[model samples]
Target: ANEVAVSYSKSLKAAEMDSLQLPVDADGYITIFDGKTFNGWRGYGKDRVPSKWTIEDGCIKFNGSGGGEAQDGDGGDLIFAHKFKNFELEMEWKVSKGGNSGIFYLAQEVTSKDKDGNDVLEPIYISAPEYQVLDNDNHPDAKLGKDNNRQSASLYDMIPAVPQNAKPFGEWNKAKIMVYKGTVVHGQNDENVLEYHLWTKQWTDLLQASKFSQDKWPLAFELLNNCGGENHEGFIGMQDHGDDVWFRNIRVKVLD
Candidate 1:
């Protein structure tokens, strides 16, 4: 965007970002990427980027060789190597015709031993909230959730955004996520499509009724369900959903 710019690297940098023609929004926003490489992101909890993901054509993209099948494991999500408790974030994303992906915020990570008895770290999708990314017309999950809740721009299975405002494949779509105090808003294209208060009874009730219910991802619910939305602030991530997805114009502004 015309607002700000920064160089690329293993990930984006802040000191050099200040040396770029940065934007000074009303709240002081800075671009995390200068649009050449993934200098601003990495696999959650790991310093090294994975083989399944990389930068291509000025956008951060997946390996793009999976034949559109859903990704299993090993390909972890790419998260901004920074912490943000409250902020306004923006990124432009596009999915292949049948691709599925998402934006995970307030993400937390933990380490454990894998099958080979090696130290392994896993991103906790259960603890953070998500902004869904999908090809509604093609991705099966788009047609599976209750009340269209799994569709793009919804809170990924917890909320629904019907009348999706996404552009066609190969076209860029503008997305903005604003989080402040306990309020969060998800905007797609140009419309404010999803809004809710975090850590409220209503939110918890929805969590109980959704996939995060006791019958669902228990560890996730156990880690995240609460009246106050704390204990889950670590990273901002892009869902490495296996299918190829592209992202550009990544930027954020800390809110006071």
Candidate 2:
């Protein structure tokens, strides 16, 4: 099936156009991963630079055989040089056996909290709601409570995907995210899998019931505020879930 079409609030300029589309016109949107090099991204630390990520055969290959942390080990977390407000993002990815990774949106480059309530430091990977990618059959973490929401196409521990809808491990899966105003929608393999309105009474209620509420983590609350998943426009990113994964055909269209 073709990718599912998604829509969001549009700027007056965008509203006059036809339907929203990817590979947007000049000035409308830009590609983050150029099919050849890591020009628009940088690694997390001062003096620490992006390492090991390369474009080959039109795909961004991470740690594929010859590459690893040793090459540019301390580059820390890599991030897009630019930050976006409201937009639609689409991409295709495939994982190796036991592979794991994720795509993050509205991500902030700084120290933040993990689920454990501990403080994670500099050039840290934080913020943004995550589209979890993992090996369902091989990763033991998949079986953990609520972690399932941290699986492919989930809201990263906030909402779970309808299982049986995801492609199997080692196969390519298409995913899309649409952010408009304070509402967000997610799609996988052309199916609308989940949607949420940020910072609303309903959203707060959902948060109150989440495992995160019981953690008593200040950092978690701080992250939620900074990340703006509750209500704000921000950047887009991919997660290096400490595992090998491949991504490509990444494209986006800005709504406003």
Name the candidate that leads on lDDT: 1
Candidate 1: stretches off by over 4 Å? 1-27, 67-74, 111-123, 226-232
RMSD of each: 4.7, 8.3
Question: What's the lDDT for all of these models?
Answer: 0.72, 0.62
lDDT of 2 by residue, 63-174 (tens): 6342322334422344554455678888898877777677777765455477999965532333456777777778765777574775678876678877537788889999
Once model 2 is optimally superposed onto the true structure by TM-score, how far is the C-alpha of residue 130 displaced, in angstroms?
0.7
Error of 2 at 27 (Å): 12
Cα lDDT of candidate 1 equals 0.72
Please give the RMSD of candidate 2 to the true structure: 8.3
TM-score of each: 0.82, 0.75
Q: Note the residue pairs that clash in candidate 2.
A: none
- Report the C-alpha displacement of residue 4, candidate 2, in angstroms: 24
Instruction: Identify the leading candidate in terms of TM-score.
Output: 1
State the lDDT of candidate 1 residue by residue for 1-256, as single tens digits. Answer: 5465433224332221322455545557777766675555677656667778877877888765554334454567787766676788889999888888888887766555878999765444676788888888888898997888998888988888645888876678888888887788999987888888877788778888877786786656765574223533446788877788888888788776
